[PDB]
Write an enzyme that holds these catalytic residues in place. Structure first.
Site, PDB file in Angstrom:
ATOM      1  N   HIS A  37       5.827   6.395  -2.474  1.00 40.18           N
ATOM      2  CA  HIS A  37       7.126   7.019  -2.806  1.00 40.18           C
ATOM      3  C   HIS A  37       6.878   8.491  -3.169  1.00 40.18           C
ATOM      4  CE1 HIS A  37       8.407   2.798  -4.510  1.00 40.18           C
ATOM      5  NE2 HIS A  37       8.445   2.818  -3.191  1.00 40.18           N
ATOM      6  N   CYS A  87       0.825  -1.219   0.000  1.00 41.97           N
ATOM      7  CA  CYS A  87       0.000   0.000   0.000  1.00 41.97           C
ATOM      8  C   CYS A  87       0.841   1.243   0.000  1.00 41.97           C
ATOM      9  CB  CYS A  87      -0.925   0.020   1.211  1.00 41.97           C
ATOM     10  SG  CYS A  87      -0.040   0.192   2.782  1.00 41.97           S
ATOM     11  N   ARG A 131      11.836  -4.724   7.093  1.00 42.98           N
ATOM     12  CA  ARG A 131      12.678  -4.167   6.047  1.00 42.98           C
ATOM     13  C   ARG A 131      14.034  -3.744   6.617  1.00 42.98           C
ATOM     14  NH1 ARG A 131      12.950   1.080   3.545  1.00 42.98           N
ATOM     15  NH2 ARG A 131      13.748   0.976   1.414  1.00 42.98           N
ATOM     16  N   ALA A 189       3.024   1.756   3.132  1.00 44.26           N
ATOM     17  CA  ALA A 189       4.271   0.971   3.073  1.00 44.26           C
ATOM     18  C   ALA A 189       5.294   1.746   2.267  1.00 44.26           C
ATOM     19  CB  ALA A 189       4.019  -0.358   2.437  1.00 44.26           C
TER      20      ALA A 189
HETATM   21  S1  ICS Z   1      12.445   1.538  -3.054  1.00 42.47           S
HETATM   22 FE1  ICS Z   1      11.049  -0.081  -3.681  1.00 42.47          FE
HETATM   23  S2  ICS Z   1       9.640  -3.982  -3.084  1.00 42.47           S
HETATM   24 FE2  ICS Z   1      13.071   0.899  -5.140  1.00 42.47          FE
HETATM   25  S3  ICS Z   1       9.081  -0.279  -2.641  1.00 42.47           S
HETATM   26 FE3  ICS Z   1      10.277  -2.054  -2.211  1.00 42.47          FE
HETATM   27  S4  ICS Z   1      14.452  -1.196  -0.951  1.00 42.47           S
HETATM   28 FE4  ICS Z   1      11.822  -3.665  -3.572  1.00 42.47          FE
HETATM   29  S5  ICS Z   1      12.509  -3.800  -5.687  1.00 42.47           S
HETATM   30 MO1  ICS Z   1      10.943  -4.445  -1.168  1.00 42.47          MO
HETATM   31  S6  ICS Z   1      11.217  -0.148  -5.941  1.00 42.47           S
HETATM   32 FE5  ICS Z   1      13.561  -0.474  -2.867  1.00 42.47          FE
HETATM   33  C1  ICS Z   1      12.040  -1.767  -3.194  1.00 42.47           C
HETATM   34 FE6  ICS Z   1      12.635  -1.708  -5.056  1.00 42.47          FE
HETATM   35  S7  ICS Z   1      10.929  -2.314  -0.123  1.00 42.47           S
HETATM   36 FE7  ICS Z   1      12.723  -2.474  -1.441  1.00 42.47          FE
HETATM   37  S8  ICS Z   1      13.137  -4.592  -1.998  1.00 42.47           S
HETATM   38  S9  ICS Z   1      14.678  -0.720  -4.812  1.00 42.47           S
HETATM   39  S1  CLF Z   2      -3.550  -0.844   3.586  1.00 41.84           S
HETATM   40 FE1  CLF Z   2      -4.176   0.505   5.379  1.00 41.84          FE
HETATM   41  S2  CLF Z   2      -2.340   1.889   5.593  1.00 41.84           S
HETATM   42 FE2  CLF Z   2      -1.591   0.002   4.477  1.00 41.84          FE
HETATM   43  S3  CLF Z   2      -1.038  -1.516   6.070  1.00 41.84           S
HETATM   44 FE3  CLF Z   2      -3.293  -1.813   5.631  1.00 41.84          FE
HETATM   45  S4  CLF Z   2      -4.440  -0.640   7.489  1.00 41.84           S
HETATM   46 FE4  CLF Z   2      -2.229   0.154   7.097  1.00 41.84          FE
HETATM   47 FE5  CLF Z   2      -4.421  -2.976   7.980  1.00 41.84          FE
HETATM   48  S5  CLF Z   2      -2.473  -3.488   9.121  1.00 41.84           S
HETATM   49 FE6  CLF Z   2      -4.226  -3.531  10.606  1.00 41.84          FE
HETATM   50  S6  CLF Z   2      -6.134  -3.639   9.315  1.00 41.84           S
HETATM   51 FE7  CLF Z   2      -5.668  -1.398   9.503  1.00 41.84          FE
HETATM   52  S7  CLF Z   2      -4.266  -1.369  11.464  1.00 41.84           S
HETATM   53 FE8  CLF Z   2      -3.100  -1.316   9.468  1.00 41.84          FE
END
Ligand code: ICS
Ligand code: CLF
Ligand code: ICS
Ligand code: CLF
Ligand SMILES: [Fe+2]
Ligand SMILES: [Fe+2]
Lengths: 458, 517, 458, 517
Positions: free
Chosen positions: B183, B50, B84, B53
């Site tokens: 991003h 999402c 991460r 994230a």
């Molecule tokens: S930011 Fe992106 S999914 Fe570019 S959200 Fe994701 S630490 Fe991946 S392929 Mo997890 S666009 Fe980085 C990535 Fe690549 S979290 Fe890391 S490995 S190089």
């Molecule tokens: S798409 Fe939304 S912003 Fe993204 S990770 Fe999901 S809530 Fe959070 Fe969820 S994990 Fe549980 S059910 Fe809500 S508290 Fe949060």
């Protein structure tokens, strides 16, 4: 490590730090994976499903499949009904589960999505093939914890499936609570040793602790079968292990199908395992077999043999309520002291049950907190140290910073291999716990003692 | 063919939307048009995340001396607690480091019903009084806009009272279609409110590494090589970053762009605003690393820097050549598929091929058409409804700070020389002929690929690893690096190769079938 | 610690230091406790009996009963005939075992005491009450090791008890070797899961791993019954698990009673457990059940899931030959390297089998020594380090001094509690071993890594 | 009574011999004659050990910079590898310490058939060349005399070649009837060949502690207190001892005798040869410790020392008085039995009674009539066939070194004042009336005691501990201290009490019966 955590405590009323809980939906996902041929479905934005699947994989080192409604910003305006209807069409066509178990997220709950309506609309439109089932529960993440999510999914399973058809099955239902697959296997082994027919639900044994055979199977061999879930309404009695996880389903089954229930502690330790065995014997008239008696006697032998390393030891525990209640009692039974005892999951019962056992044993000066977190426990330890820490993986930072013998317990454990094959329940599980506890206590003694105090025998 | 076998089981409406997401690049069509950055099909078993994230978990969280407060119920915070692997150390051995903590407002029902702004205000003040960080971030989650909480205003009020910056990010999870929207949301606020606010003096040979998050120590490994050549690494956005280093990101002569997807907004805006040019940085694999260091040397056009660059390259490669030879001996002839987020499916390719490993399928969760094809296509890209509400920020030259770093003669000259200044091609334009690309690959697609191509190895993430391995196929993780690393840099090649050979040659793969079968 | 052990190695031909064996009699004592209602008897000076009983109690944290002839200087001149006749009269009257199992010491062996003569003289004199039995073996401590002593006592049981009477029992005999009671339990569990009737002997389950019931029973519930020991002569086949401990007995029973035998590795790890299961299946026609296949699949799953921590790891192993052969093969199966491999027990087989498995895996540069000791292994480690040490309790000194992750294995383990409840054999035991090995490798990694390299998930 | 109940099941021959080994102390016969130090009845399940244990395992082993080589098959060596918890540290932080090792000639069949003397010679030289110890010990085991090995000659030949002392001990296991013979064998050689060979200058207020082996750090705890008062602890025989300290044991003014049984030979021979008097000491229990410290001060008869003695006794008691009160609260009214080897059954008694615990039954494995009845009875004792062949050595005054330490008139006055000079009384004297002594107690005997008296606790060793505990009765170990300690000294009382209360109040004792029974 954790250098920003002060010894001097200032009251935190708003900032939650390093929580001792997560949100409902993973609990409901885990419960759904305890149904055979079930695909759990997350009704919300897809970030939730990804994260919830991920934690299960990190804990079990196993696949953890689930689908999502993948809400976009448009659902924020027109609701999630069209998303879930589209999902169901794709699910049954691509992945063909026998049952879709739906839970919700904070998003769909904030929006007031109406799952009973969407589900009846799909039924009317023909998107649910003949023989297939779609069930749901509501799992608002701003209420309770993952334990509550498990409880709610269990209630959903009874709401949709349990039926009293008049044909008695001679079985006892057991809802094992928010415990691992090894625990489920050990509970089932005890029923089988007592010669007592049963239905366990949910049951993740053979789903999240399965073999590698060279062929990936989307729906593993385990899980409670749909037909047995229906048949739970014909049972003699339901045993609800762990009130937080299991009572809501048991009570719902009593209202819907007239099956009485008995609530029991999660069977960790001597008295809690004893109470489970006694309830089985009292409900069925069956004698306790020699094998079970021998295991209890081996536990007692071990508790006595290892007593010197346990008496008076101060223990910090953090975890989910049903398991930490039972484990705290076991710590007392070992002769040790639950010194700091915390759950992230709200509820009065934890406070009352822990306070009661502490007073029964004459223990003063312990701190017990509901909706406490790992930052609390660390601050308490900085003011008065402990001899042992028991928690999930996140305890490891405290264990290293404060040099405390550390036992991984509960959910999630993401940093060791094979724990999901080890029971913590029953006499057998208790033995494993006492071995772990004494092992980490003795490892520290032997690493830190002066050379002249090093010993062959312990 | 493979595309038809993948498409077969989809119902008609899904089949029609998914077909454009699967392309076979070849001799005659070198840069085939792909459909990317569209909504996920409900119920299809995606790996996507999402916007929260993407904003909090990916771009902002690595800033180690800023307290990151999740405004939401507890899960959004819990699931960003160490999964991460961005690495941090206290700056100068003494500065603040919050990597081991997660912070939130732990929203309850009363916050949903009556609003959560009072609890957020209190949490911001508690974090300030307890930690005195360089700054505080406030990150939206799913419920925040819907329940009517104005986090921008709460942050501005709080900042004025406590006297440090407080940055609000409207990264509600349903925004956009993937981590990518997050991003963008992060880049907007970093560019407008952080970058350029510092007052450090610029040093000689100053570069930034943009889009680099120090996963498993990658950035420390890149820095080791860069510092040895002679560069001054001004800022890494955002791996092991201090807030202050991000504020002084404008004190550099050249931006290296490792992850184009996540950081291109800031790269383009720093060029418009400050005149700092950028190049694509490819620090994974010997070929990538070497080409990057050579391109950087051409940009600075300094005889001694160029000489040092070649001396360093020769010695780093000589120190690992015996390992490289071993990996090729042990791996050549094997086949791979790769599935990453938005960049690593591409950046790891020069490296498998060096070992004699052929990559047949590359999948992406959330890359855009500009990542697959190139940045020439941006004007031909149709803005879609689900990402149209992400704000577009426009910057103009800072009259006081703008400077011509590389004058126009030299830029032309460099472009001719093969140095792609302030531009980028794509995973496709450098992949071999025959490569099949799958945007937003799902479980169904993956399993068809596995059954039809029978690859020796399939690189992916944690959700897929065990699915693949239950089928007797090795799956090394390209996000978490299976809890090792670095995989970037020269030493990265060695760590990656050693872990890969170890994986392939694990004896248990050959013991799956019991002898009674 | 161990500060006097030099790095520079000088050949030692006479001075034995920190041995990787003990003497025969305790192995015979252990075998004898694997007979129901048996009192082991030590024919020698009483210092031996006290030491041998002691090591068993330190290992098992249980009682370990045995009697002695209590030789004085008188017996050293006239022999021990009068002592053992006096002993037997006191034993049957005070302690009333069903069978006295006599072994000898270096003293009675050096003297050439004639046990068959004393025993016939006792029978003639009526010192042995009807229904009671006295058996013996000869256990010279200057030959072999405690493993040899176990082997000799098994032969003595066969010599005195086993009888082919023509009434086929349909059973398979299993001699489990010099393994612990948890291993015996696991081997029985597998026979029972395959549905194969059997006689295990000796069997110390329920003797050295027993419960506390609040009443002391001199002769615990367990042990192979004398009537079943007699009946081993009527069996279809004998499976001899571990050649050093078990072959002598199996071969003796073949000569005496015509029961054919098959020799198998102690069932530790994948191929050795597989060979055992396949021997059972081939001997009886019975199919391998899903429960066993699932356990195997879970072991494979674990080996693959944990593989990164195991590949290429250098292991030092010391112990008893049957166990170390099978464990060294398992170490190779895990993708690790048996680097230093030592037994204190003499014999060619160990050297050939370890050499052969190393060659098959392409491993060069390992050191394998028969009649090596812990001082040898320590010096080797000072010259080239290892990543893992597996041995009995006495390895703890090397583990601390050289900072090596350490797994307690084999005999004796005197410094931890409950290990005698944990199998090392079978697929279940294999899973336990992997857990232990990965746990100690990860514990070291996480204790010693820099703070910035500390990890949540592993 | 209990004696008749114990004797009932024995066959007539055995009953008649065992009867004399059980006596009851009463008002009318406060000091009953007991039969002790006779052969063990074969088959009776004794706890006794052998003479090699008493020589190598007990007296000599703790000398930490001497290499102790067992000349025998491997078990004699293996079984003396750290089971007895004598604690050692490198002298002055740098000296040799062989506590963690065991050394053997690992006799094989060829040694039994052809003799073991060449292997012994070679082992001695290997030890010398590898370790350069202060001295080497060679200990006989069961086969040695019978196979014809003259270890005395091998030792002397080796010693002359290598230039350090080599001491042979003919402690074959079957000699005597118990560990006691081994003590005697050790003392003979220590006295004749080690003590008095040094040349260090004597210090003021010098004392030795004799028959103290530093189990679990006991000796260090007694040294802490003694040194605080102002004594110089010249030597402890043999806990934490160096070889050179034993060589200089003659440089003392007073010998404290903790274990009478094991060290009385040397005490008496030192008095004869050097003029050094001895007193019985007991550093276990507040009452024993205090009476010992008061007796020592009366011997030295020095105002400063006498005053410091009271100041230290008051300060040490005040620091632990809260604990002592606690132990008595938690334990008073409970009953115990004690079974140890030849000394601890007696020395621990002042302690249990201080806690309110009544000791009903006491025994020794191998004590002599002197230990039970007092040394007053030594004229009446005659040695039987089984112990006759232990050499009895005679010493004569050393013309150069003999001194009158305490003049005869002062000796007379101290004895009248209750100081136990060159004298010893016995376990029986300070046991109360109605209580039973069992010499060479066996399993049968112990089980009758347990069934008939139902004691709350029964202190013994490792072979009895789990037998007793399986019957639901606490058994703390009085040899190994259950891997704790010290149990001697003021800190020892607290350690002992804490462990004992912990054992009694272990919750599992009350959980033995399952709820279904
Ligand atoms: S930011 Fe992106 S999914 Fe570019 S959200 Fe994701 S630490 Fe991946 S392929 Mo997890 S666009 Fe980085 C990535 Fe690549 S979290 Fe890391 S490995 S190089
Ligand atoms: S798409 Fe939304 S912003 Fe993204 S990770 Fe999901 S809530 Fe959070 Fe969820 S994990 Fe549980 S059910 Fe809500 S508290 Fe949060
Ligand atoms: S020497 Fe003796 S058996 Fe006096 S052989 Fe034995 S370390 Fe005992 S009662 Mo073990 S005469 Fe010492 C003894 Fe007492 S080994 Fe220790 S505790 S005070
Ligand atoms: S009574 Fe004493 S301990 Fe016994 S042997 Fe004799 S000196 Fe020694 Fe030694 S090797 Fe083993 S343990 Fe014996 S049977 Fe021989
Ligand atoms: Fe797995
Ligand atoms: Fe026990």
């Amino acid at each position: 490590m954790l250098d920003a955590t002060p010894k001097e405590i200032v009251e935190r009323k708003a900032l939650r730090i390093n929580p001792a809980k997560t949100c409902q939906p993973v609990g409901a996902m885990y419960a759904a994976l305890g149904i055979h041929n079930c695909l759990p479905h997350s009704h919300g934005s897809q970030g939730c499903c990804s994260y919830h699947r991920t934690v299960l994989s990190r804990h079990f080192k196993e696949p953890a499949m689930a689908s999502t409604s993948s809400f976009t910003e448009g659902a924020s305006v027109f609701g999630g009904g069209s998303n879930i209807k589209t999902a169901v069409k794709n699910i049954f066509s691509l992945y063909n589960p026998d049952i879709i178990a739906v839970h919700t997220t904070c998003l769909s709950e904030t929006l007031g999505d109406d799952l009973p309506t969407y589900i009846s609309q799909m039924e009317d439109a023909g998107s649910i093939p003949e023989g297939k089932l779609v069930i749901h529960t509501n799992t608002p993440s701003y209420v309770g914890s993952h334990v509550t999510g498990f409880a709610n999914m269990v209630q959903g399973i009874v709401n949709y499936l349990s039926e009293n058809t008049g044909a008695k099955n001679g079985k006892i239902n057991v809802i094992p609570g928010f415990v691992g697959p090894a625990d489920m296997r050990e509970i089932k082994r005890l029923f089988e040793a007592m010669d007592i027919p049963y239905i366990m639900f949910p049951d993740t044994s053979g789903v999240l602790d399965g073999p590698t055979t060279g062929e990936y199977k989307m729906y593993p061999e385990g899980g409670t079968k749909i037909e047995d879930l229906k048949d739970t309404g014909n049972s003699d009695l339901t045993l609800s292990l762990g009130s937080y996880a299991s009572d809501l389903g048991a009570k719902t089954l009593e209202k819907k199908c007239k099956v009485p229930f008995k609530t029991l502690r999660t069977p960790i330790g001597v008295s809690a395992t004893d109470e489970f065995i006694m309830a089985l014997s009292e409900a069925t008239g069956k004698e306790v077999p020699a094998s079970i008696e021998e295991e209890r006697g081996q536990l007692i032998d071990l508790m006595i043999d290892a007593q010197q390393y346990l008496q008076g030891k101060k223990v910090a525990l953090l975890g989910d309520p049903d398991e930490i209640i039972a484990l705290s009692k076991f710590i007392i039974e070992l002769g040790a002291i639950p010194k700091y005892v915390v759950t992230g999951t709200p509820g009065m019962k934890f406070q009352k049950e822990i306070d009661a056992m502490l007073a029964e044993a004459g223990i003063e000066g312990s701190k017990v907190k509901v909706e406490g977190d790992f930052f609390d426990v660390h601050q308490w330890i900085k003011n008065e140290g402990v001899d042992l820490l028991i928690s999930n993986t996140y305890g490891k930072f405290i264990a290293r910073e404060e040099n405390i013998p550390f036992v991984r317990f509960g959910f999630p454990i993401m940093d060791r291999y094979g724990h999901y094959y080890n029971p913590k329940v029953g006499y057998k599980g208790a033995i494993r716990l006492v071995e772990e506890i004494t092992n980490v206590i003795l490892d520290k003694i032997e690493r830190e003692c002066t050379e002249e105090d090093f010993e062959v025998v312990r | 063919n493979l595309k038809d076998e993948i498409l077969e089981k989809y119902i008609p409406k899904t089949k029609k939307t998914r077909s454009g997401h699967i392309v076979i690049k070849t001799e005659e069509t070198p840069n085939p048009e792909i459909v990317a950055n569209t909504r996920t099909v409900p119920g299809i078993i995606t790996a996507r995340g999402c916007a929260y994230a993407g904003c909090k978990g990916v771009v902002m969280g690595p800033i180690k001396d800023m307290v990151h407060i999740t405004h939401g119920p507890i899960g959004c915070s819990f699931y960003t607690w160490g999964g991460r692997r961005f690495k941090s150390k206290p700056e100068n051995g003494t500065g603040l480091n919050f990597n081991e903590y997660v912070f939130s407002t732990d929203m309850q029902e009363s916050d949903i019903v009556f609003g959560g702004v009072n609890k957020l205000k209190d949490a911001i003040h508690e974090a300030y009084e307890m930690f005195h960080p360089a700054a505080i971030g406030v990150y939206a989650t799913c419920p925040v806009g819907l329940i009517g909480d104005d986090i921008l205003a709460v942050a501005a009020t709080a900042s004025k009272e406590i006297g440090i910056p407080v940055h609000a990010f409207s990264c509600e999870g349903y925004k956009g279609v993937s981590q990518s929207a997050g991003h963008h949301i992060a880049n907007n606020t970093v560019m407008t409110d952080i970058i350029g606010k510092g007052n450090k003096e610029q040093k000689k040979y100053s570069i930034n590494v943009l889009g680099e998050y120090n996963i498993g120590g990658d950035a420390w490994e890149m820095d080791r090589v860069l510092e040895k050549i002679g560069y001054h690494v001004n800022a890494t956005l955002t791996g092991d970053a201090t807030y202050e280093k991000v504020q002084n990101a404008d004190k550099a002569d050249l931006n290296l762009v490792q992850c184009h997807r996540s950081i291109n907004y800031i790269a383009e805006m720093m060029e418009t605003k400050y005149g700092i040019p950028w190049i694509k940085c490819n620090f994974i694999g010997v070929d990538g690393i070497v080409e990057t260091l050579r391109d950087m040397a051409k940009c600075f056009d300094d005889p001694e820097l160029t000489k040092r660059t070649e001396e360093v390259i020769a010695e780093e490669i000589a120190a690992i050549q015996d390992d490289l030879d071993y990996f090729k001996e042990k791996l050549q002839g094997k086949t791979a598929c790769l599935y990453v987020g938005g960049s690593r499916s591409h950046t790891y390719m020069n490296m498998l091929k060096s070992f004699g490993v052929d990559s047949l399928v590359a999948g992406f969760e959330f890359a855009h058409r500009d990542d697959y094809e190139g940045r020439e296509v941006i004007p031909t890209i149709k803005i879609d409804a689900d990402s149209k509400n992400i704000p577009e920020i426009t910057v103009t030259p800072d009259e006081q700070k703008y400077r011509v770093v590389i004058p126009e003669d030299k830029v032309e000259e460099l472009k001719k020389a093969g140095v792609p200044l302030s531009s980028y091609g794509g995973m496709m334009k450098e992949m071999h002929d025959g490569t099949i690309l799958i945007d937003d690959m799902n479980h169904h697609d993956m399993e068809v690929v596995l059954e039809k191509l029978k690859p020796d190895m399939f690189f992916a993430g944690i959700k897929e690893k065990f699915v693949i391995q239950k089928g007797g196929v090795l799956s090394k993780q390209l996000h978490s690096y299976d809890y090792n690393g670095p995989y970037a840099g020269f030493r990265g090649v060695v760590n990656f190769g050693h872990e890969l050979v170890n994986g392939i040659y694990t004896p248990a793969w050959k013991m799956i079938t019991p002898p009674w079968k």
